[PDB]
Design an enzyme around this catalytic site. Structure first.
Site, PDB file in Angstrom:
ATOM      1  N   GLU A  53       0.801  -1.219   0.000  1.00 18.29           N
ATOM      2  CA  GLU A  53       0.000   0.000   0.000  1.00 18.29           C
ATOM      3  C   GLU A  53       0.843   1.283   0.000  1.00 18.29           C
ATOM      4  O   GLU A  53       0.326   2.373  -0.261  1.00 18.29           O
ATOM      5  CB  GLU A  53      -0.959  -0.009   1.205  1.00 18.29           C
ATOM      6  CG  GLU A  53      -1.878  -1.245   1.254  1.00 18.29           C
ATOM      7  CD  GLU A  53      -2.695  -1.350   2.546  1.00 18.29           C
ATOM      8  OE1 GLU A  53      -2.105  -1.196   3.640  1.00 18.29           O
ATOM      9  OE2 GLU A  53      -3.918  -1.607   2.462  1.00 18.29           O
ATOM     10  N   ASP A  59     -12.474  -5.630  -1.186  1.00 19.02           N
ATOM     11  CA  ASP A  59     -13.415  -6.707  -0.960  1.00 19.02           C
ATOM     12  C   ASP A  59     -14.647  -6.116  -0.272  1.00 19.02           C
ATOM     13  O   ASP A  59     -14.633  -4.951   0.126  1.00 19.02           O
ATOM     14  CB  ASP A  59     -12.744  -7.721  -0.041  1.00 19.02           C
ATOM     15  CG  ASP A  59     -12.436  -7.126   1.329  1.00 19.02           C
ATOM     16  OD1 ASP A  59     -13.338  -7.093   2.208  1.00 19.02           O
ATOM     17  OD2 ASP A  59     -11.301  -6.656   1.514  1.00 19.02           O
TER      18      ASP A  59
END
Ligand SMILES: CSC[C@H]1N[C@@H](c2c[nH]c3c2N=CNC3N)[C@H](O)[C@@H]1O
Ligand SMILES: CSC[C@H]1N[C@@H](c2c[nH]c3c2N=CNC3N)[C@H](O)[C@@H]1O
EC number: 3.2.2.9
Lengths: 232, 234
Positions: free
Chosen positions: A12, A197
């Protein structure tokens, strides 16, 4: 103007790390901080590690050691709001612990003694983030983001979060810890994450498949937000 | 004579007795925490009041380590007893600390483990040994073993049952220990938890906590006092 940026996973923060010029790295308390400029703006990027304590430790070092003016938390998240799709952006107007519980003594669910029930993100950071969203034609939702030390994968875990926080637009594992630390140091913050998700029974597979896409989208958004805060 | 012992308590009640005993005391207010420096029976100490929960404890431990760089850390205070022979007032000494509410099992990590961390954080053998020595000299009832932390006040029912099932060996449950151990681990600083029982985490744990917080504080504090002395002069 120094802008702090905190990401949990290497994945990230790697793209942003790659763009930092006049880059210096500090290894401390098991964390890594990269200082320098991102497209001309002074930043302090921290890879904290996963979970609330790792993020708290990391945010604490970042604040005491680099003294940023504002904190931006980037990364992935499980989407809860019905309009959200993988890759979409979630912006916090607030963060709360979905797993903190001291109601036995009359505190609001999610609230820890000595803290407000929820930590509010900074209004200007939120407006800037949203102008970036509009200029980039991104699909996003603004609202309550809840954090816990558990990966949500439907079943009982998801049910408890919906019961206690039906308006939560997303769930993850570092946001509120960072907000909490920023709160204690009086530093403004904002969470800007991308969905990997939807925290259901297939969230582990979706996370495996969409972490990279989530990391890139939030990463691009953070890049634009840094530029907008720096030059109107 | 050149050792600085770090001591961390979550609540004011839990640090107040030790604070009152600090010679040449001075106070530092930072990041929402309070740090008292000075000496305890001649030994240099740094006592932090962290606030309740994992994040508050982590933020405080980080400030304490980074700012005062103590040689070791002692986490004092109350806890919910889980081992069978524990009664209110008794001492619990950690030989290890684990989060009972961390769950990344969907990705193959051990229950309680967070990615990038060991499944559990081991307390220091010397600090542990010294603590048992103090326990023997004070003739107190105590248990050594795994202590588990979470951001929830365990009050019987499923909260308690899930903990007994996931950690059958856990002897106590509270809310800062593992967060402190976690921070100490990342800085490679020796730590040990030495708390005292205020309730048994059942349906009546809030009432019991209300009534015995004081005794738990007294008993953990006395132990901390004795451990500091012991660590400094054998
Ligand atoms: C590998 S644990 C998941 C990481 N990504 C974020 C996340 C994405 N999707 C979910 C996360 N965390 C919990 N439940 C979820 N469904 C969290 O903040 C962790 O850093
Ligand atoms: C007012 S929350 C309880 C505080 N005391 C400790 C504690 C004692 N007994 C219990 C605690 N924490 C959770 N469940 C329990 N049964 C925790 O570490 C908090 O700092």
């Amino acid at each position: 103007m120094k802008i702090g940026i905190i990401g949990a996973m290497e994945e990230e923060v790697t793209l942003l790390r790659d763009k930092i010029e006049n880059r210096q790295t500090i290894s401390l308390g098991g964390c890594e901080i990269y200082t320098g400029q991102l497209n001309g703006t002074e930043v302090a990027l921290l890879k904290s590690g996963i979970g609330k304590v790792a993020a708290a430790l990391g945010a604490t070092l970042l604040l005491e050691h680099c003294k940023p003016d504002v904190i931006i938390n980037t990364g992935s998240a499980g989407g809860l709001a019905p309009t959200l799709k993988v890759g979409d952006i979630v912006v916090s107007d607030e963060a709360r612990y979905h797993d903190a519980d001291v109601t036995a003594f009359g505190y609001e669910y999610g609230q820890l003694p000595g803290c407000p029930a929820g930590f509010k993100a900074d209004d200007k950071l939120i407006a800037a983030a949203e102008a970036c969203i509009a200029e980039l034609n991104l699909n996003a939702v603004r609202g309550l983001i809840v954090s816990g030390d558990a990966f949500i994968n439907g079943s009982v875990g998801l049910a408890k979060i919906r019961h206690n926080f039906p308006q939560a637009i997303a769930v993850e594992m570092e946001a509120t810890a960072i907000a909490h630390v920023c709160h204690n140091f009086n530093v403004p913050f904002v969470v800007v994450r991308a969905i990997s998700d939807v925290a259901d029974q297939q969230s582990h597979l979706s996370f495996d498949e969409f972490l990279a896409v989530a990391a890139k989208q939030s990463s691009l958004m953070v890049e634009s937000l840094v530029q907008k805060l720096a030059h109107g």
